[PDB]
């Protein structure tokens, strides 16, 4: 199960 | 109120009358929901995460309720592993990171 | 501090005498740093999120200063786009989410 939900805009 | 980080910071959200679980995410610029149907105009965007990039659809001015707080703004929809409430909406609902 | 979320929460970190910048990420279970040389034994892991998975190396009992708060813990090292302080170490430095 994934655990790193870094997210960056366009 | 005040949320520990000993476990994942998961909260119920309500969007279009559906209840969803979502992660309060300071490491996300934007709010990204798993695939779902929303009304109105959209534009396709590419977002990056830890393992690479994904395509999402951007929808603007969508009403969401996050842990009791009404918000209205931009929602990206795509193949995220978990629903994520990112800084755009955390700022709307008054959320800070304290230590 | 009470860090506001108008901008990415990037903070000073110090590890092994090196000054770096990291993102405080409530959406990350664990702390993962860009490739760097650390001392001691390590074990390969995979970590995942948006975009899929990456291979990292796990080091134990690494001292790290985060915003001047001292922590000691497990640090993953690998090809993350940005240095990330996850909940493992956010908890040690006393971090809460407050709405």
Curated annotation (Swiss-Prot), chain A:
Modification after translation: Gag-Pol polyprotein: Specific enzymatic cleavages by the viral protease yield mature proteins. Capsid protein p24 is phosphorylated possibly by host MAPK1; this phosphorylation is necessary for Pin1-mediated virion uncoating.
Superkingdom of the source species: Viruses
Site label Cleavage, positions: 5-6
Family note: Belongs to the primate lentivirus group gag polyprotein family.
Domains as described in the record: Late-budding domains (L domains) are short sequence motifs essential for viral particle budding. They recruit proteins of the host ESCRT machinery (Endosomal Sorting Complex Required for Transport) or ESCRT-associated proteins. p6-gag contains two L domains: a PTAP/PSAP motif, which interacts with the UEV domain of TSG101 and a LYPX(n)L motif which interacts with PDCD6IP/AIP1.
Miscellaneous comment as given in the Swiss-Prot or TrEMBL entry: HIV-1 lineages are divided in three main groups, M (for Major), O (for Outlier), and N (for New, or Non-M, Non-O). The vast majority of strains found worldwide belong to the group M. Group O seems to be endemic to and largely confined to Cameroon and neighboring countries in West Central Africa, where these viruses represent a small minority of HIV-1 strains. The group N is represented by a limited number of isolates from Cameroonian persons. The group M is further subdivided in 9 clades or subtypes (A to D, F to H, J and K).
Name by which UniProt lists this protein: Gag polyprotein
Residues of the full protein shown: 446 to 455 of 502
Swiss-Prot record, chains B, C:
Signal peptide region: none
Highest taxon of the lineage: Viruses
Catalytic residues identified in the record: 25
Stretches assigned to the Peptidase A2 domain: 20-89
Chain segments annotated as coiled-coil in the UniProt record: none
Region (Dimerization of protease): 1-5, 49-55, 88-99
Function statement: Aspartyl protease that mediates proteolytic cleavages of Gag and Gag-Pol polyproteins during or shortly after the release of the virion from the plasma membrane. Cleavages take place as an ordered, step-wise cascade to yield mature proteins. This process is called maturation. Displays maximal activity during the budding process just prior to particle release from the cell. Also cleaves Nef and Vif, probably concomitantly with viral structural proteins on maturation of virus particles. Hydrolyzes host EIF4GI and PABP1 in order to shut off the capped cellular mRNA translation.
Subunit structure of this chain's protein: Homodimer, whose active site consists of two apposed aspartic acid residues.
Protein name: Protease
